Structures are given as C-alpha cells and as structure tokens.
Design goal:
Two copies of one chain form a homodimer.
Chain A: E1 4-10, E2 19-24, E3 27-31, E4 47-50, H1 53-57, E5 62-67, H2 72-75, H3 78-82, E6 90-92, H4 94-107, E7 114-116, E8 122-125, E9 129-135, E10 144-150, E11 153-157, H5 177-186, E12 190-194, H6 207-219, E13 225-228, H7 234-246, E14 250-254, H8 256-267, H9 280-283, E15 291-295, H10 305-310, E16 324-327, H11 336-349, E17 352-354, H12 369-379, E18 383-387, H13 391-402, E19 410-411, E20 418-423, E21 426-432, E22 437-441, E23 444-445, H14 450-462, E24 464-470, E25 476-482, H15 489-508, H16 513-532, E26 537-541
Parallel strand pairs in A: 3-5, 5-6, 6-7, 11-12, 12-18, 13-15, 13-16, 14-15, 16-17, 18-19, 24-26
Antiparallel strand pairs in A: 1-2, 1-20, 2-3, 4-22, 8-9, 9-10, 10-11, 20-21, 22-23, 24-25
Helix pairs in contact in A: 6-7, 15-16
The structure holds uridine-5'-monophosphate (2 copies), manganese (II) ion (MN) (2 copies) and zinc ion (4 copies).
One uridine-5'-monophosphate (U5P) binds at residues 15-16, 139, 196-197, 230, 233, 332-333, 364-366 of chain B.
C-alpha cells in the first residue's frame, strides 16, 4: 500500500542547511530551507545551500512549506530555493516570517505567500497532510515543533529544542510537553528529534540561570561592560536588557546582524527594552559603571564589533584597562582559534575577560541527554529518526533511545538524499535521490565547485609558478611566481635552465608543442622538489 | 650593581618554540631550542623556529646550553639554531639527548657537544652561572626543571611540569618537591613557571589513573582495539603495553613518529615491552580480542595511521563494526575540526569510539591551578615570570599567585624579545631585543615570510586569472584560470571584451606597455567584480 516518504535534503549527518521533504502519493510538504556556513577547507565561499534537484523535478507536487524557526540553518537558503520554485503557501510563526520577509526583500523576491500561524493551529496541505504546530523552547522565540498527520500515521518532529522551564523573560514561555505527551498516547508512528547535544549528559542549563549568573557578574563590574552573544539570542538579550536596567546601566546595541534580529523581535513583541537603546556617543556622557554594550563578534570575526574592539580598529570606541568584556557564548566548532585570538588580544589590552567554562554565562539552545530521553519517553514512537546532527550525534542519540523503558521498534541513521519509507509497520531506506551542497560565492550560485576549491587549496599550500617558454628568436624561458617564495635571483635562473633544456630537448627531438609543455613542467617539478622540497603549482605555457 | 638579564626569545605569549636567554656581564646561558607548529593562516609551511639575531650578535658570550626535555617545542629548533652558532656544551638528560642526537644526525650536524647530566648534578657556565637539575614529572620521561644560580640571586625554572604522584610505570618516578621546597628556603629571587593549564581548576589527573581507566575499558572490548595517543607519551604507552599483556593482547605499533620515540625510550630504559611488538601480519594470526594497535594520528592527520584507518586507505588493515577505537588524547587547539572529521568517519564505519570527556582516557602533561599554587607556595619567590603560555594563561597564572598567602613582590607578563632586568630588588622590562618567527617550508628557511603568506591567503580565497595581451598583429587577449570559477563561455568571452577594448582604447593613444597593464588589469577586475562579485588575483602579461 502507498507509504509515506521522508526525504531529508539537508540536515542529516551535519549541523546545518536543514530541509526535509515529506511525500505521499503526488503531494509534497517541505520543512525549512536552511543554509550552512563554509568550513575552513571551503575557502573563499560565503554560504552553502541545499541541492534541490528533487524539488525542481517534482515542483508541481509541492503543496506548501513549514518553517519551524528563524535560525539561518532553517531559513537562510530560502531566497535561493524559492526563486526556483512555484509560489506555494509558506507557514511559520510571526518572528520567523518577519525574518524571512526581510530576507526576501533584500533578495528582491516578490509575491511569496507567507502565512502566519500560531501554536495549536492545524494547517492542511493537499488532501493527505495536516500539520499541527506546538511550542518548544529554543534559543530563538517563535520556535515550533509539529505533528504531521498522514494516511499512514503521525510524525512528530521536535524541531530544534531544549526543555527550558524558564527562559527568564516573564512571558510564561514553555515547551508544550502536554501536547507531546498526548501525541504519545494518540500514537506516534515516527519521531524526528534534535540530536545536536546527544553526547552531553544531564540537562542543558536554563536561560533564567544564565541571566542570574550574568547579573551577579555585571553587578560586580566596576567600569564599562561589553557583552557579546549570538545575534539571534533574543531571550538572552532581553534578559540582559532587564538586568542592565536593574543594575543602573544603559544599553548600546551594535552590529548589523544583532540590530536586525532585535528589530524583528521588537516588531513581533518578543523584545521589550525597559529603556531606549543609546548610541555610543550618548553613553559617552555617562560614567563607566553606567555603560553596557551588547554587540556582535562572539565567533571572533575580526570585522565584527568585538573584533574591531579587540584589534583596536573600532571607529568610535577603544577598550581600556578596567573594562569587562563578557563572551555570553561558546565558539561554534571550528571557530576556536578565532575566538582564542580575540580573547588573547583582550587580555593584552588589560580588560577583565569573562567566558565559559570559568563563568557559566552561556546555555546551549539544544536538549542534552535528559531532555532527549524525556521526549523519547513521552512520545513512545514506533520508529525513530535522529536528526540535526553529525553521525556522532545521531548515533549517540540512537544509543540513548535504546536505554529507555520503551525503545523504538527501529531506529535509522539517515543521510541527506535517503528515501525513508514509512508505513504502519514499514521503516526502511528504499533508495536515494540527488542531494548535496551548492556553494554561493559572491553573486555566483554553483559556479564554484569542489574542483575549483581543490585549486584554491593547492594555491594556498604551495603557491604558484608560471613558466612561459618563448621559442623565438632563440628559445628562452620566463618565470613568474606568486606566493611561492620571496625574490631569489639565483633560484630563478636555475629554474629557467631546467625548463629550457627540456624545451630544447623537445626541439632537439621534435615533439608536439603540447608534448614539450608537459616535458618542462615535469623537469621543473623534479628540480624544485629536489632543490626546495616544495611542490608549487606549475602552470607551463609554450606560447 | 650588575643585573641579570632574562631574555625570552620564544615561549612567552605562546605555547611553542621555547628558548630563553640568561645574560650576566659577558656570560650567556641559553635554555631550550623549540619549534612551533603552524597555525591555519600560515598555510603551506612545515614548522616555525625562533629568530636568533640576539645570539648571533652575541655568540662569543654563549657559555652553554640547557635542554629540559625532548618535546618538539623545546628541541625542534636546535638543528636550525646550532648550525648558525659556536659549538658550546649542551647539557641534558639521557632521553632528551638521544632524541636530539637523532635529530642532529638527520641534518648532518657534526660534533655537537652533548653532555649527559643526571638529576642533582650541578653544571657551571663561566664565572657567573651555576645550574642545578631536578626532576619534574611531565608527559615525557627525563624531564627537568633547574635552579640557575647567579650573582644577583637564584632563578627557579619549573620546566614543563605536572605534579603526578604516580606515572604508573613502576620505576618510582616523582617530582622533586623536596628540592623545590629547599630552594624556597635558600631564597628564590625569580620563579619561572609553566602556565599551560593555569585556567584549569583543581589537579591534573595522574597517569596511573588513566592507565586504570584504559585497562577497565580494554578489558571490556569484545574485539580488536585501536588506540592512538601522542607519539612521545612514553609513560602512557608503557602503561598500555603492560595492561595489554595483562589482558592477553599482543601489541602492534605503527606510525613513524611513535616508533621513533619508542626506540629512543627503549635505548634509554624508559620503555620496556613485556612482550615483543608484532607486525600487523603477525597479529592477523590471532583472535580479535587478542589484538591491540598503538598508533599515530591522534590529531586528525589524514595521512597518519588512524587517519588512513578512518578514511579506509590503510594498506593492510580495515576497520569494521565490532572494532574499538580509543583516542587517548585531546585535540591540540586548532585541530578540533580534523579530529571531529575522523571521529565521524569512525562512527560511520560503525566502530565503538572512545574519547574524552565521555571516557577519561587522557591527562594533560601540564599542572593545573592546584599544582601551580603548590609550586608558588613552596618556592616563595620574590619575583614571578609566568611562562609557557599565551597571555590568557600567563595573566591567569599571575592572578592565581595573588590569591596565595605570600604573593610575589612583583609579577611581570613577559613578551618574546623583552629584556627583563633582575636585581636583588629590581624586576623590570628595561628594553627589547629582536625576536620573532622564522618560517621553514620544505628545505627553505626564512624564504617564506608574512608577505608571501598574504599572497597564498589571497590565492586561497579568490582564485587566479592569468591575462595575456599581445598588441600584434592586432589587439587580443588570452586566458588561463585557476580556482576562480567553473568553466563558463559567456563569462570568459565577456572578460576579454573589457580586456581587449582597454588594449584597443589604450592602443588609440600610443601607450607604454606598463600603462597597458593598468588599463588591462584594471579592466577585467572592474568587470569581474560586477559579473561574479569576486576579486580573483590577476596576473597581467604583455606578450
Ligand atoms: O544562532 C546560532 C546558534 C547556534 N549555532 C550553532 O549550533 C549549535 C547549537 O547552538 P545553540 O543553539 O546551543 O546556541 C552550536 O554548535 C552553535 O555553534 C549557530 O550556528 N547559530
Ligand atoms: O602544541 C601544543 C602542545 C601541547 N599543548 C598542551 O599540552 C597539554 C597536554 O599535555 P601534553 O601531553 O601535551 O604534555 C595540553 O594542556 C595542551 O594545552 C598545547 O596546547 N599545544
Ligand atoms: Mn569568495
Ligand atoms: Mn610547504
Ligand atoms: Zn535553531
Ligand atoms: Zn537548527
Ligand atoms: Zn613538554
Ligand atoms: Zn613545552
């Protein structure tokens, strides 16, 4: 009998560019459309978006979109994805849509059909799908999980979550554990659950506790306080606004990215400054102990605000001895060096530096094992797909589920492109569809691929040597080096002879000019390797 | 009132390339000859060595050398340093000198005057200096701190250390806290102490505890075990050989680096294999649970042994489900991504993966705050130079000393090149000498500098377009690309129009060839920036 197909196109076996496809018959529902940020080896590129070959192929089957929350790994790919697809209904909570709308406006995309929903709303897609939204606490407001009701049963997707009893903003926001528990009693065929922190024992700390730690620290700061956190951590920022007021400090917000999230949050009633934000010039009128900066740059970006402060390149402010800088954040994996470098810059300036683990001034947005186990125990799913995690995270999430009273009948470790067939008693990967990464580099989408990146790597490691041989009047060779070594006239002449004698040997014994080009390349490679121990990229031209 | 000059040339404000200069009158004693390994922005280079300009200027004053232990950041620079200096006496413990002797023989360095010492020995350097060696436990055997006795008073240098009550090898190795306490009574004018773990609360775990943990884990492993650890962790590896024997496993050691430290340790009595090492062929004859591999690649190096295992490129062995892989190691800062990649490959293969913090299978070689506090308390120093750390470590070591019952009179945060004047009542930075880094890249020493690196970074990020224009017979342009973009005919045709017209427009008014470069190079970039939004490095050539 017809089965549900769950086809992740991004977000499985990685943390980033989340997009999941649900297909039943000839109807498709898509969930999120995130981006990913480039790793160190993906040099020069700006962002990464999902391959949507599947969706282009079946674009007439798409009934609509669900957007769980406004983080970049869930809505960042949308300008790129929507531009290639028919306009379809796109459902999300208010902050999420605010962020997407601003994003599409930057892109110049028009007539996108964004539909505001709220927790509890049940939305229908085509004839065989109904989605019901429910609240899960996360590190951004208006974050949803959903129950997807299908002819074969119910799929419960947690979205991104932690179980935070108190996010500290006085708005009574809590995860809808009652709805989750009910779904378990009703029957959950498939659980899709956030695996980010599946290797962390215990419970992720509460934002209320972080806020209390921050207030205690700041309360004891004698001078100015500079604080950095993620741009989109609206709860953390709001709580910081509240304690700043209590501690008699006015707030300056700096950094486009954070100002952008702040503006959206204020427009949707999730950010409420007790006192107006001030400019740096305005707070310059106050005493040091009355000053708090909230700004970007927690990941050590030299061009971000904290970056410019740490490197002494900020236009209007200079850090000094007696300042306190707080990193209310942790380095995203791969940013350790960048953050270490700014931290050391700060210590050399002489400012008091505050960061984890010495100070507990950050809580992750994701459930640790106790919280993951709670969702598993409440939902009691027959089948289980650990999601939003690299393989290490998915597999340890799967191991955690085995320890529980009522382990799932089968757990699968899905990969992007996997076709996961779901029936009342079916749970298997039946096949694969085209999936992967598309690089965005400046205006270019997909014009930079791995083969292009491979060159960039080689250039990066070994630098460049251009050998141009000129046959007339008498054959001579020309050497141009870029990022190879500093000028060395002796070696330059030495490289010329090696190429030349190979060029003359291709003339002493006639070969095609194309053949001789390869011959001198090989000679110069051998010499240089012996002479310098280096293997520079050599570009020979016999023209 | 002659003063002692303490001149760090490397190892202050960094972890790596330790070398410290002590000058009094016209006598110089040098301590250590370390390299540093490159960071991510120093692409393509193999290693980094100290600038020794100061020693070159003053080479006749050098009376002797002290070598505290055999780690790369204390002896790795020696082949490059000794080659430019007079052959002075070089004092060290036996394993230290065995490692140095191998290293110097590879470089062709003849007649280096290596002199073995033993703990407790007093070594005189000219009139002004007497040095006394003493034992500090570390993550390599034959590791020493020393007391340097000068006319102005006594300098105690901890060397690299932890305070490990039991390294587990049964040879009764302990730190000489008695001698250190006695130095405190005799009077310690200056204390130089290892700041590596100064931000870590508590006490670094004992190797004996790590060995017990490993044995408990390995006891439970149903099949083959693969364990990686630092090549020079002689204690850990010996402990593993003995636990392996007890658990009835035979041991294979692979990885050139590890075998190298193993051979020197064996030759100097610090490693005694209870059973002979077997080859991978030979263990292949045994049952799975009789097999233990000890190998390199703990840092994620794809070509190292664990690397090739994880990527499935090892010539003779293939990991499989049921295997257990233990990373008895932590990622050295900056290696997190490389190790994470290996770990995920291992999960995907399906092996059991054991690493910290989930399993306590690694302990640092360096003292945490409790151990640091002990040394400060025992030495009771008048002046304090926190050393072997980045500024964050140094300054946190300085704060730690302030919390203690008898804080130092003055503490300074030294930088490389600082002239620290030491008197009975003087402690200040009076001057600076030339200090810094020298890049080694293949055979070349100092032929790659920061300016060269800037280019490699540039190539790395934006790719390359070589652009050639010949005015004859009529103006035209030819293009070779590297790492810029995937082949696009429209883009390529369009770049030449900018390039050729600028040559033709440049041709209309007779122009110098160099003037053509400005129009030609300038034309493509102007266009290219509009077209792709990117700025590839361009090499203009007139044919
Ligand atoms: O806005 C965010 C927040 C978190 N993360 C990353 O996703 C994981 C979860 O972060 P958090 O939600 O726990 O802050 C972490 O690895 C973090 O680096 C992001 O990329 N962007
Ligand atoms: O390049 C290096 C080498 C060693 N360590 C330090 O060495 C300690 C582990 O002890 P050991 O086994 O490396 O001596 C760690 O705390 C680590 O900080 C570094 O940080 N960077
Ligand atoms: Mn780019
Ligand atoms: Mn190189
Ligand atoms: Zn999120
Ligand atoms: Zn997410
Ligand atoms: Zn060491
Ligand atoms: Zn060291």
């Amino acid at each position: 009998a017809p089965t549900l197909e769950v086809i992740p196109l991004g977000g499985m076996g990685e943390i980033g560019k989340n997009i999941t496809v649900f297909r039943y018959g000839d109807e498709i529902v898509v969930v999120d459309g995130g981006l990913a940020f480039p790793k160190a080896h993906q040099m020069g590129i700006d962002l990464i978006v999902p391959r949507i070959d599947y969706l282009l192929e079946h674009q007439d089957k798409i009934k609509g979109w669900i957007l769980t929350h406004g983080h970049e790994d869930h809505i960042g790919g949308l300008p790129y994805i929507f531009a290639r697809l028919p306009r379809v209904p796109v459902y999300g909570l208010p902050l999420t849509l605010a962020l997407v709308r601003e994003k599409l406006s930057e892109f110049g995309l028009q007539d996108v059909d964004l539909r505001e929903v709220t927790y509890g709303d049940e939305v229908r897609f085509g004839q065989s799908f109904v989605a019901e939204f429910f609240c899960m606490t996360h590190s951004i407001p208006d974050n949803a999980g959903y129950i997807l009701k299908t002819p074969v049963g119910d799929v419960l997707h947690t979205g991104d979550f932690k179980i935070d009893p108190d996010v500290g903003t006085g708005a009574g926001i809590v995860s809808d554990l009652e709805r989750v528990e009910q779904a378990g009693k009703d029957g959950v065929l498939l659980l899709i659950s956030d695996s980010t922190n599946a290797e962390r024992p215990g419970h992720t700390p509460s934002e209320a506790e972080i806020a209390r730690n921050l207030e205690e620290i700041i309360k004891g700061c004698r001078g100015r306080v500079f604080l950095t956190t993620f741009a989109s951590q609206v709860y953390r920022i709001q709580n910081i606004l509240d304690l700043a007021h209590r501690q008699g400090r006015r707030v300056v917000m700096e950094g486009r990215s954070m100002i952008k999230y702040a503006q959206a949050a204020q427009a949707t009633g999730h950010m409420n400054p007790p006192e107006p934000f001030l400019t740096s010039e305005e707070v310059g009128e106050l005493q040091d102990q009355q000053v708090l900066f909230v700004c970007t740059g927690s990941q050590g970006q030299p061009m971000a605000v904290l970056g410019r402060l740490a490197f002494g390149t900020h236009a209007k402010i200079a850090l000094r001895r007696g300042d306190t800088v707080i990193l209310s954040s942790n380095p995203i994996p791969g940013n350790e060096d960048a953050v270490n470098l700014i931290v050391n810059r700060l210590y050399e300036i002489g400012v008091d530096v505050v960061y984890p683990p010495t100070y507990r001034v950050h809580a992750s947005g994701h459930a640790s094992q106790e919280e993951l186990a709670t969702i598993l125990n409440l939902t009691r799913p027959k089948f289980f797909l650990p999601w939003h995690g690299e393989p290490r995270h998915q597999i340890n999430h799967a191991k955690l589920a085995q320890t529980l009273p009522r382990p799932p009948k089968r757990t699968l470790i899905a990969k992007n492109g996997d076709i996961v067939n779901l029936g009342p008693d079916e749970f298997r990967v039946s096949g694969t569809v085209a999936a992967g990464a598309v690089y965005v580099d400046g205006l270019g989408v997909g014009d930079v691929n791995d083969d292009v990146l491979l060159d960039r790597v080689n250039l990066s490691q070994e630098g460049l040597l251009i050998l141009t041989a000129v046959l007339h009047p008498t054959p001579h060779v020309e050497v141009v080096a870029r990022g190879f070594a500093r000028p060395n006239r002796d070696l330059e002449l030495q490289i010329r002879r090696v190429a030349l004698e190979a060029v003359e040997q291709g003339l002493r014994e006639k070969k095609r000019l194309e053949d001789v080009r390869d011959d001198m390349y090989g000679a110069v490679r051998r010499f240089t390797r012996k002479a310098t121990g280096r293997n520079p990229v050599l570009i020979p031209m016999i023209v």
